[PDB]
Design a protein around this ligand. Structure first.
Ligand code: NA
Ligand code: NA
Ligand code: NA
Lengths: 208, 208, 213, 212, 213, 205
């Protein structure tokens, strides 16, 4: 199947696509309503028809309030006119999958920086090929943050780890600069698409 | 020509369409990423094919920072997949055209409420069939606001007129509750489309 | 003529009111967040005392917020349920507006800056001005730190209404007069609902929704 | 042979234009210029298949107009010009309007007005002299009530620019006017042609905005 | 080895610096907003004094903001122009970071909360922590009223750097030590640019852009 | 260090001198600066028994304030310094107000304001070791938008537009203008820190 993947939930702007081949475009600059569409076009041509796309995946957040919503609106529009379904994926999960692909982390406590001196928090454990949510995602002060494993070896991924000193527990290793990447969204979309998780364009929405 | 018109720049959510017939759907509720797409579908069917649409018009703002951007992203997506051009129209202008259609105002000082104790300000004068910007749009404190006519009879339209008491001049009549309406955007789009003002989906952007 | 039901649970106050044959009746109690426990019993008691059947109700007004997240949503649910089952319209009205209209009933203020305490050290804020009996909004409603707050008037006498005014010392302007204990009251929601019902502003139960600021 | 590159971002218009081997090319888009100006410059040199090394002078709109927009153009021009070791040609945006209005409507006497901040207009009057719109008097920033032409009460003249949205507060008005004209780099380039011919070019460091 | 040019005009300070053959040279002047008037002459003088050709420059670093709206954008323009004409990459670096790295050079602080005065009674804010020679950002940068400001540390010694700290009395935390006069300095931009150039973070001139917060 | 200080920023015209650690000042309100400044310099110089060649540096109010008066004091200063081959010290008029209001009314913190068309010049200063130092940044703003960085005084012509500030102060002087003696004070601080520059670079805000 051919799948398209967009993410504008952070500073990062990223798009990716899966005939059987898989390609990725990733640019860090804070604007998203400007560079998104071009990145789409650049990728479709340097690889493929748009009406050939079977489903579109997106970061649903959490992240930037406006950022996530720009991607949603684009995806909402693209998918409606194409009449194809969409694939809602968490940005904390994408971070999880990224820290897997990049550093081989099988247990990832993902944390993205939030407003009002808080962090978005989500813990992910590798099951089969995929990072999968352990418990639930939350918006917490860094001092209230907690993991669902015993402390085992686990990894901290994302900007929320700037607040590590204020947290009650720290992993062996961590990357405070990781951001959701469209490649990883695409991996996660594979699992979701194969499980028939797609939904109609309207139901594409950000998380609360 | 067949034209589609969306606006989510304020509390108001509105969509409109022009074969030769003209229809409008208008709902006031603060959410926009939920009700927009449905309103599109409801209108296309209760009147017409989506791939028959020749151009799409939108409120470019000013207004709600996120609100305008949701409409943009939708329009950006719709238009790209359809491969049709778009029609950028100011929300202050739509207010102008609304106050014309509704109360017969040929000179309209449009004012939309803005952040940080300011108003978005734009003055419009009826030329031929259309309200047209007199000077330029700005973001001002209400005490610095000014009109480009002599004080003649002119109208105040929009939420910025809550601050009327703080302004240095007041019109004969005003409506502090007017909001941009997709019908009026569609009128304004007629003039813009007939003048060949359309642009490629990417260039669809909010005003600063 | 019109029979209207009004419910509010947006703050510490739980209140309900009924317009029937030009007469208005109200029950108002302050509890903290036992609202789910007490909102229906109150509707029941009010209808019972008035001798009015629920089927007689033409529209249900509710406080739409802002205020407590769970509080507001309890009102929303009950109202949704009632109006869907009856197949009647609902009227959404702001709690800041309700504050404004109450300050006008109790203290005679015609120019009110309604403020409600909010989470995370902000306050909800909306300024209202009397027009033909109805306190109508001037500008927009917002959630702001009390420092960034501002009125749309110039020399004008105005009133500070609501528990947001507990932050008055942290706020730029102080009004001539103020009341920081004041809560939305369903009797005043009923007045505002009347004006809205006259303009036919009612919606279907599915659209009985809280505001986001 | 003189090759001239021309940039303008003084108003909501963003335009570039090139003069090479007696040919004039130009792009124009109405929409944050810092994102757009340089890409436009690239696309243009490409479309004409010319290299930046060939360019002999860089012309720019020196204002009046948007405070930051003018400065974005001045900054790019300064930077291009310094690295390239080329001179720069400062041209008024009121003049460019006048030159555009002449090209587009044959007006030989143009009162250019650009809407300015704080309820004023930028005002300058121009008249054709050997194919170049030349300033008659001074440029000013004025309330529209205090605006005046240097000509006798209607030969006819023309009102050009967004300052003309204030026509009703002005003490006189022309027979014809276009309150929607904006500077266009094609006209900047015509004007640049004249200034280059009189050796008006200056060092990159001196590319600066005007204050009125 | 690498020859790098660094320009900053984001605040009242106009500065420029050059890395050439391991040696670093700088010019720094405080003027108010005559930047367009003085930025190129400064580049010229610096190159002249160093005896370095502009063609020798491998990359141009710039302060990307936050700071003055027009100030920042003047730097952007000049840099865009220079790098496009030369066909060399640019390196965008935060002015809060520059502040942080300067406080580390001058006062030896390893934990800095950089704050810059901003329009409309807010301040720009970003907290930085030394890592292998480089002050690296901890969390995110923001524009906040000085009341809502907060650090990502616990017991830890930290430094307040920049003119945002003119609002220290209105701010929740006060650090052990502070400097509210401190401005971004191009010498320190040059250090940060080095780390970025080592990781190959350079972009094309068309992407030399200011930040939005 | 012998320091000469000049101000014509506003309507008031003033000059001051620091010789042999003694500080002397002449102040005169006159709406005429291109006419009375140099006489004042010569008179003050006579009265101190000092020759202009003695002077090590020249301080001046760089603005903001009346555009004409500022531009003349700047010009005079540049001329004096070029010819004597002496460094110059640019000091804000808002800082000068804040230093005056300290010296005169005891104010440990001041919010200086000077009327400009509609807007007013704004700057807030705090005392730090006898010197009124700037808090945030100086700004030009409309009276309503004006903020504060915090028992605090309000100084300058711009405090005549007091209503809807939004904040009103403890006490205030709306007719307070810059004074050379307080420019002198501030200059001594600047001098001692090596803040001098070339005549070429004396310039307004
Ligand atoms: Na609160
Ligand atoms: Na104007
Ligand atoms: Na500030």
């Amino acid at each position: 199947s051919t799948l398209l993947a967009l993410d504008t939930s952070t500073e990062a702007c990223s798009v990716a696509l899966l005939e059987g081949r898989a390609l990725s475009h990733y640019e860090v600059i804070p604007l998203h309503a400007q560079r998104l569409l071009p990145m789409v076009r650049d990728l479709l041509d340097e690889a493929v028809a748009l009406s050939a796309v079977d489903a579109i995946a997106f970061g649903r957040g959490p992240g930037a309030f406006t950022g996530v919503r720009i991607a949603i609106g684009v995806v909402q529009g693209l998918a409606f006119a194409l009449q194809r379904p969409v694939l809602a994926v968490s940005d904390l999960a994408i971070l999880a999958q990224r820290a897997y692909r990049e550093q081989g982390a099988e247990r990832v406590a993902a944390a993205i920086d939030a407003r009002m001196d808080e962090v978005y928090w989500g813990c992910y454990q590798l099951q089969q090929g995929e990072m999968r949510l352990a418990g639930s995602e939350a918006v917490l002060p860094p001092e209230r943050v907690a993991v669902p494993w015993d402390a085992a070896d686990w990894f901290g991924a994302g900007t929320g780890w700037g607040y590590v000193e204020r947290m009650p527990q720290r992993p062996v290793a961590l990357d405070a600069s990781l951001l959701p990447h469209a490649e990883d969204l695409l991996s996660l979309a594979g699992f979701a698409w194969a499980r028939g998780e797609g939904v109609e364009a309207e139901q594409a929405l950000p998380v609360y």
